[PDB]
Design an enzyme around this catalytic site. Structure first.
Site, PDB file in Angstrom:
ATOM      1  CG  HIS B  40      -0.219  -0.024   2.534  1.00  0.00           C
ATOM      2  ND1 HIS B  40       0.370  -0.553   3.245  1.00  0.00           N
ATOM      3  CD2 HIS B  40      -0.034   1.242   3.024  1.00  0.00           C
ATOM      4  CE1 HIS B  40       0.589  -0.074   3.935  1.00  0.00           C
ATOM      5  NE2 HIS B  40       0.541   0.941   4.685  1.00  0.00           N
ATOM      6  N   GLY B 141       4.135   5.842   9.809  1.00  0.00           N
ATOM      7  CA  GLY B 141       5.368   5.560   9.194  1.00  0.00           C
ATOM      8  C   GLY B 141       5.772   4.418   9.398  1.00  0.00           C
ATOM      9  CB  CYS B 143       3.480   0.476   7.479  1.00  0.00           C
ATOM     10  SG  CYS B 143       2.265   0.668   7.801  1.00  0.00           S
TER      11      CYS B 143
HETATM   12  C1  LIG Z   1       1.342   1.744   7.953  1.00  0.00           C
HETATM   13  N1  LIG Z   1       2.590   2.809   7.950  1.00  0.00           N
HETATM   14  C2  LIG Z   1       0.351   2.032   8.811  1.00  0.00           C
HETATM   15  C3  LIG Z   1       0.772   2.517  10.290  1.00  0.00           C
HETATM   16  C4  LIG Z   1      -0.689   2.467  11.315  1.00  0.00           C
HETATM   17  C5  LIG Z   1      -0.820   4.288  11.403  1.00  0.00           C
HETATM   18  C6  LIG Z   1      -1.710   4.042  13.110  1.00  0.00           C
HETATM   19  N2  LIG Z   1      -0.803   3.375  13.120  1.00  0.00           N
HETATM   20  C7  LIG Z   1      -0.737   2.013  12.675  1.00  0.00           C
HETATM   21  O1  LIG Z   1      -0.519   1.092  13.122  1.00  0.00           O
HETATM   22  N3  LIG Z   1      -0.410   1.762   8.147  1.00  0.00           N
HETATM   23  C8  LIG Z   1      -1.165   2.596   7.974  1.00  0.00           C
HETATM   24  O2  LIG Z   1      -1.816   3.475   8.023  1.00  0.00           O
HETATM   25  C9  LIG Z   1      -2.875   1.400   7.204  1.00  0.00           C
HETATM   26  C10 LIG Z   1      -2.882   2.207   5.960  1.00  0.00           C
HETATM   27  C11 LIG Z   1      -3.757   0.440   4.901  1.00  0.00           C
HETATM   28  C12 LIG Z   1      -3.930   1.444   3.481  1.00  0.00           C
HETATM   29  C13 LIG Z   1      -3.461  -0.245   5.095  1.00  0.00           C
HETATM   30  N4  LIG Z   1      -4.318   2.085   7.765  1.00  0.00           N
HETATM   31  C14 LIG Z   1      -5.098   1.601   8.751  1.00  0.00           C
HETATM   32  O3  LIG Z   1      -4.318   1.015   9.520  1.00  0.00           O
HETATM   33  C15 LIG Z   1      -6.034   2.514   9.886  1.00  0.00           C
HETATM   34  N5  LIG Z   1      -6.648   1.231  10.526  1.00  0.00           N
HETATM   35  S1  LIG Z   1      -8.121   0.796   9.416  1.00  0.00           S
HETATM   36  C16 LIG Z   1      -7.435  -0.599   9.017  1.00  0.00           C
HETATM   37  O4  LIG Z   1      -8.931   1.867   8.713  1.00  0.00           O
HETATM   38  O5  LIG Z   1      -8.856   0.801  10.612  1.00  0.00           O
HETATM   39  C17 LIG Z   1      -5.664   3.165  10.201  1.00  0.00           C
HETATM   40  C18 LIG Z   1      -4.764   4.107   9.596  1.00  0.00           C
HETATM   41  C19 LIG Z   1      -6.602   4.401  10.268  1.00  0.00           C
HETATM   42  C20 LIG Z   1      -4.842   3.426  11.971  1.00  0.00           C
END
Ligand code: A1D7M
Ligand code: A1D7M
Lengths: 292, 300
Positions: B40, B141, B143
């Site tokens: 992603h 950041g 991920c």
């Molecule tokens: C990747 N770096 C990031 C890390 C998140 C940000 C907050 N803590 C974390 O672990 N992951 C994301 O931003 C992902 C992106 C998608 C496309 C995989 N989004 C989320 O994890 C999202 N949660 S969800 C699935 O929508 O409930 C957040 C950003 C709202 C936490």
């Protein structure tokens, strides 16, 4: 989430060296052109024997190798500083970071890089207790392992391990060579400061619990007690006067608002949990770690 | 002492990289001549849009730098493998250790190397829960941060981070690209299987308490319960059938012998504590933890 956070061990790993002296093997850390190890590698001595015994210690007997770099160092001069040995070697350590020798106050946390034969085997987390001991994990040959902190590029060296006591407590020096507490590097019975709870950290763990588990626990006290009334109770119940550190107030006050539980209720909860407690790893969470 | 032991992160630190794609920045790991990072980084796509989007992703828009080695890598070709991108680069990583991609079963632990901008900031310990989530600690950041273990010289990679669900649970893939459990890399509500305790690890926690804090705590049950009776109770109280892994029994029987407390008394203590605990702090925690595995508590 809210986890016990540890500092990456990469910088420490590249500076660890083995120190073997006439069949006595432990670890040392190599910074600039100096290797710091515990002085009892040269023998089990007491009191003020150390000065003369170090002066006669032959430099060629210090077998010093750095496993991560595959180099064997050669000692040019030996200087005892406090209860540590400063071994000057011919080679400067190219991997030396910006570092600082900083002493810890009790209630503070640090990462232990427990090494054997100069190689970091395990990494775990400890808090210096008010009895000036850590409750760690060490076997034979682990002396010389360091407890450290990181802030950006800078390695903050805090601890070098020396002794294990009968009740699985561990003592050591700062990197200046001065022990934490009244303990020394001699295999005899040594009186210990009676245990006392670092109240700030107990408050930090309870808040961490109310921020991770879902519903407010039933054992959470319903009435709040004044800080002043808690400190009268604490004086007679092996708890440190609150706050242990005035600077922890901003963290604890911030936890109190995120959790919507006044700190005065947390303290009354501590008092009411006395039957359960009547050392047991309640002071492992510092307010700064929980808040950040 | 018995401590939560973490694997030294130096091997992983030397291979972490930053991967930034047209405004989206996360980490990756650089092994041999390949950089592995979550897919992603190229966009927040759903379903089966990934095959096409990756195929048209310009190799030049991949800014890949390795901070601890001062290198900036250049991406030759991109290839999706599972939910991960495999970015081939011109340069081989000389710090590449002997490594293996190993998938974790629930109840096992690993060290998380929490990274940002290609630099490991924190290092902590998690266990894969029976919902195939980890209870970790991550911000934006992060991920691309990996979970790993070490058997002497070999780096065993188990995990790469992708998602945070609102209950502060985290999800990702192994290094082959397949997620743990039914979760996917999309910002939607995803059904979670109800929580269940990894009974072997809860047993290991109470044994850790007997062996380092207090040999005879007042909450230690006096009578025991049979494994069979416990499993009947466990089916209605969100505890996994004991034992979850048959190989834990060697460690559990060892802990029972040194603690001279049969595991039947530990299992009955688990049942009593669901009604009797009243805020008791066991091995440093105020609830049941699956962080202590029998192997770690026994071997140490
Ligand atoms: C990747 N770096 C990031 C890390 C998140 C940000 C907050 N803590 C974390 O672990 N992951 C994301 O931003 C992902 C992106 C998608 C496309 C995989 N989004 C989320 O994890 C999202 N949660 S969800 C699935 O929508 O409930 C957040 C950003 C709202 C936490
Ligand atoms: C140094 N490498 C070593 C590590 C000990 C070994 C057991 N666990 C550890 O942490 N330290 C020692 O062996 C020291 C040596 C003295 C001279 C400084 N001795 C002890 O720790 C001693 N404890 S004591 C002071 O006698 O109660 C042991 C060997 C009995 C643990």
């Amino acid at each position: 989430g809210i986890k016990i956070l540890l500092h990456p061990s990469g910088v420490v790993e590249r500076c660890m060296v083995s120190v073997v002296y006439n069949g006595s093997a432990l670890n040392g850390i190599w910074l600039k052109n100096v290797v710091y190890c515990p002085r009892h590698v040269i023998g089990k001595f007491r009191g003020d024997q150390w000065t003369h015994m170090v002066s006669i210690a032959d430099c060629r007997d210090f077998i010093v190798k750095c496993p991560i770099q595959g180099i064997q160092l050669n000692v040019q001069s030996v200087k005892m500083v406090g209860a540590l040995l400063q071994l000057t070697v011919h080679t400067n350590n190219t991997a030396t970071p910006d570092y600082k020798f900083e002493r810890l106050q009790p209630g503070s946390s640090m990462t232990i890089a427990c090494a054997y034969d100069g190689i970091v085997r395990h990494v775990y987390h400890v808090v210096l207790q008010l009895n000036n001991l850590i409750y760690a994990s060490f076997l034979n040959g682990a002396c010389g392992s360091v407890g450290y902190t990181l802030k950006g590029k800078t390695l903050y060296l805090h601890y070098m391990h020396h002794i294990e006591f009968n009740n699985k407590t561990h003592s050591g020096t700062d990197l200046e060579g001065n022990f934490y507490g009244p303990y020394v590097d001699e295999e005899v019975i040594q009186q210990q400061t009676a245990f006392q709870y670092y109240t700030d950290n107990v408050v930090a763990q309870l808040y961490a619990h109310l921020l991770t588990v879902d519903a407010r626990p039933k054992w959470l006290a319903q009435s709040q007690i004044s800080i002043e009334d808690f400190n009268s109770w604490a004086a007679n119940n092996s708890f440190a006067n609150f706050p242990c550190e005035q600077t922890n107030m901003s963290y604890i006050m911030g936890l109190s608002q995120t959790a919507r539980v006044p700190v005065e209720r947390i303290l009354n909860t501590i008092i009411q949990l006395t039957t359960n407690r009547d050392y047991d790893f309640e002071c492992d969470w510092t307010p700064e770690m929980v808040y950040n």
